[PDB]
Amino acid sequence: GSHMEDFVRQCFNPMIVELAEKAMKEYGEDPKIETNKFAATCTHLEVCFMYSDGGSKHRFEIIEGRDRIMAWTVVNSICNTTGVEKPKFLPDLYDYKENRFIEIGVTRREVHIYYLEKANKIKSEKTHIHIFSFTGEEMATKADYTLDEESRARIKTRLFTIRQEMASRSLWDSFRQSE
Numbered sequence: 107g108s109h110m111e112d113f114v115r116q117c118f119n120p121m122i123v124e125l126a127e128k129a130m131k132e133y134g135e136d137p138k139i140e141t142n143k144f145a146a147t148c149t150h151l152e153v154c155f156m157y158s159d160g161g162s163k164h165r166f167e168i169i170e171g172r173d174r175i176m177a178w179t180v181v182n183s184i185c186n187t188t189g190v191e192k193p194k195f196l197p198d199l200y201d202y203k204e205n206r207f208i209e210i211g212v213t214r215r216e217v218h219i220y221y222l223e224k225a226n227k228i229k230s231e232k233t234h235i236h237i238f239s240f241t242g243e244e245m246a247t248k249a250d251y252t253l254d255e256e257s258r259a260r261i262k263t264r265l266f267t268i269r270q271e272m273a274s275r276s277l278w279d280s281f282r283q284s285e
């Protein structure tokens with residue numbers, strides 16, 4: 107029974123916690139041992155959900171949070187509908203407004219290193235990339251941050267609140283030196 111797991115359950119939405127647990131167990135990792143990964147997956151899930159909530163009521167198709175098979179099914183449908191290229195790796199969202207898959211990233215480094223890694227992994231940069239950080243920084247492909255600055259500011263504020271709570275529980279240091 108870690109302090110990090112209890113904090114993750116006390117701070118995040120129950121559906122988010124349940125989805126993070128299912129996702130981690132799908133790839134063979136236990137939320138009760140890899141607690142920093144647990145908090146990281148919960149944070150990524152919440153950030154993608156807030157992102158999809160931004161903009162119109164039906165602009166984004168959510169890809170993260172589904173089962174791997176069903177998410178791949180939804181991306182297959184999206185591509186075979188809109189003609190976009192089938193991404194080599196599973197993204198997080200799809201923008202119907204801009205007709206492009208979005209890979210959302212939350213990092214405890216600089217936006218530069220995580221963005222370079224994600225882009226190196228993306229190869230053919232058809233999928234848009236958008237990186238948020240726990241210090242309020244963000245970086246999107248071609249400086250196209252997709253949403254207006256109010257929702258992105260709401261996401262940054264949520265990230266910093268999570269960070270402050272972790273630090274007040276003295277769990278921020280181990281959470282930072284783990285990515």
Ligand SMILES: C[C@H](C[C@@H](C[C@H](C[C@@H](C[C@@H](CCN1CCCC1=O)N1CCCC1=O)N1CCCC1=O)N1CCCC1=O)N1CCCC1=O)N1CCCC1=O
Pocket residue numbers: 119155156158159168170171172
């Ligand atoms: C109270 C309010 C609730 C949020 C819920 C929503 C998350 C997400 C819900 C599930 C649906 C589950 N399944 C099972 C299979 C079919 C299926 O659909 N998943 C996960 C995969 C994609 C998806 O749809 N949904 C549902 C509606 C759209 C959406 O994104 N969201 C979005 C903001 C953060 C959050 O949690 N809702 C409901 C609508 C408005 C809203 O905000 N909360 C919780 C805390 C913050 C907040 O506002």
Ligand SMILES: COc1cc(CCNC(=O)c2nc(-c3ccccc3C(F)(F)F)[nH]c(=O)c2O)ccc1O
Pocket residue numbers: 129130133135143145146147150151170196197198209210211212
């Ligand atoms: C084994 O690896 C995992 C893979 C998945 C399925 C697909 N992967 C993602 O969809 C995804 N995974 C991460 C990530 C990876 C490692 C640690 C922390 C994170 C983060 F959530 F905190 F950011 N980051 C993203 O941006 C992102 O899109 C699911 C769970 C896995 O542990």
Ligand SMILES: [Mn+2]
Pocket residue numbers: 170196197198
């Ligand atoms: Mn993802």
Ligand SMILES: [Mn+2]
Pocket residue numbers: 150198209210211212
């Ligand atoms: Mn992502």
